[PDB]
């Protein structure tokens with residue numbers, strides 16, 4: 258039976274590019290589509306709504322982009338004011354002292370990532386084709402059903418599960 262099979266190509270599960278040891282732009286290229294399969298927003302025991310794993314995520318894998326428009330740091334106060342006056346919930350992520358991502362109007366599911374003192378995700382800024390993106394990566398293998406969390410690293414109380422909880426977000 259294995260006779261015709263002696264020369265056949267052996268097959269196995271394909272590894273996702275988001276999870277492979279490739280240069281960042283190759284990894285980032287299919288992040289949008291892959292992220293939709295990997296994570297979803299559900300109610301969270303930590304706070305309100307959270308981001309959850311729908312399909313196992315590899316350690317070190319690109320999980321999702323913190324999507325939004327890159328804006329100058331000095332446009333930030335005015336936009337917050339404007340969102341306030343309109344009854345819009347503001348979501349922003351600082352890139353550095355000069356730039357932030359504004360996810361308020363053109364954001365995605367990454368806005369719903371809760372804080373935890375014992376996180377399973379971390380963030381990086383990457384430049385792809387001249388454009389800055391904030392990308393969330395998994396610190397460890399993450400399994401279907403687990404909540405994805407990040408350390409905000411900012412008083413106001415902390416609701417994370419952590420045994421080493423810091424008790425306050427800030």
Ligand SMILES: Nc1ncnc2c1ncn2[C@@H]1O[C@H](CSCC[C@H](N)C(=O)O)[C@@H](O)[C@H]1O
Pocket residue numbers: 303304305306307368369370371372373414415416417426
């Ligand atoms: N560990 C934590 N403990 C208490 N509140 C938290 C928290 N992590 C996130 N939050 C809340 O969520 C906000 C970040 S936006 C994250 C999504 C949010 N849970 C939502 O339902 O829309 C924080 O300002 C804080 O209000």
Ligand SMILES: [Zn+2]
Pocket residue numbers: 373374375415416417418419421422423424425
């Ligand atoms: Zn905590």
